[PDB]
């Protein structure tokens, strides 16, 4: 099939949770209290007490800022859609897709039953039984899925996620995460490697 | 052959398109120090290529073309026709049906 | 699953702008001087792990 490493079709970027950077096993980077979680780039969070999510998915404020700063110099002085000629096929905003859904609340819905696939019916009599073959059975009321709308709507929980299907995550070693020039300002800081950092 | 075998039923075989990769990636050896390429002045034996294992020429070229032009335009000479998917297949977007 | 490939021939093609010779011989003499070395940079420009 496709070979992402050779052709650029990267499709597992939504699977990262956090990344942390630590020089000399003590000097955390970016440090300097920069992010809302200063010692870690928290890419996404499964639960958000403080409200650090954005864009109506679960990606963080910190990460969304870093990606918009690194690709387009956008975060400081407000977010907007990047101009189309600077938003190529491998760019961030071109590929970023936030999503939300509702599911039956299996804990708080007291009348719930866990019907597994062989026992679910909907379109019985008019559909093949567990196969792309001839119709079987009789017409009957459907038992699945539970309704999430109307007056008889069932108690429900929200799920949130995002996809990013051709990007590869970036972290510029630049003092404000922006691209000011191809040789960054930290890259002509840290020549200082007389203590040679690990 | 039998009366019950009259009821056999068939399904079409799954579609499987085969062709060369985008920009012919994978055809030539790059960044692969067993099978390196050569460009040398015929007199003096020093290869000018000098490639490495931790380099990625194929991805580098794929990225370059997206910065130099519009990947949505196919071009048969270089077999350039970028990989995609139907966005309505990647994200189901189930609005039901107008019935 | 049965696929295979055979190469019958591989040829190298080159195309030349038909430059006036007094111009090309001038361009060569400028590009051979060590002040004018061509330089290039891999577009990805990274070490891969």
């Amino acid at each position: 099939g496709s070979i992402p490493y050779l052709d650029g079709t990267f499709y597992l970027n939504h699977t990262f949770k956090k990344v942390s950077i630590m020089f000399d096993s003590s000097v955390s980077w970016p440090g300097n209290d920069r992010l809302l979680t200063p010692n870690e780039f928290e890419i996404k969070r499964s639960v958000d007490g403080e409200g650090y999510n954005v864009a109506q998915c679960n990606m963080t404020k910190d990460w969304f800022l870093v990606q918009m700063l690194s690709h387009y110099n956008i975060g400081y002085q407000g977010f907007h859609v990047p101009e189309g000629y600077k938003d190529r096929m491998y760019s961030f905003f071109r590929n970023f897709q936030p999503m939300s859904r509702q599911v039956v609340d299996e804990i708080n819905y007291k009348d719930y039953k866990a019907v597994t696939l062989p026992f679910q019916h909907n379109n019985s009599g008019f559909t093949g039984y567990l196969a792309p073959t001839m119709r079987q059975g009789q017409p009957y009321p459907a038992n699945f899925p539970y309704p999430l709308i109307g007056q008889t709507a069932v108690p429900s929980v929200t799920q949130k996620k995002f996809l990013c299907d051709r990007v590869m995550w970036r972290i510029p070693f630049s003092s404000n995460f922006m691209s000011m020039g191809a040789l960054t300002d930290l890259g002509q800081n840290m020549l200082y490697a007389n203590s040679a950092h690990a | 052959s039998s009366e019950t075998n009259l009821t056999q039923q068939s399904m079409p075989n799954r579609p499987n398109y085969i062709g060369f990769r985008d920009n012919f990636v994978g055809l030539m050896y790059y960044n692969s120090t067993g099978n390196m390429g050569v460009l040398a002045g015929q007199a003096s034996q020093l290869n000018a290529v000098v490639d490495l294992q931790d380099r990625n020429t194929e991805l580098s070229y794929q990225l370059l073309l997206d910065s130099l032009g519009d990947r949505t335009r196919y071009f048969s000479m270089w077999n350039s026709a970028v990989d995609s998917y139907d966005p309505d297949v990647r994200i189901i977007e189930n609005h039901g049906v107008e019935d | 699953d049965g696929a295979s490939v055979r190469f019958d021939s591989v040829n190298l093609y080159a195309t030349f702008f038909p430059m006036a010779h007094n111009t090309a011989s001038t361009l060569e003499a400028m590009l051979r001087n060590d002040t004018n070395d061509q330089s290039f940079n891999d577009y990805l420009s990274a070490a891969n792990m």
Partner: peptide, 21 residues
Amino acid sequence: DINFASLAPRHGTRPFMGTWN
């Protein structure tokens, strides 16, 4: 990739069309 071009051109023509000095 900080879109890694950086190249030589800064160029222009005569009262239409070029021979150099």
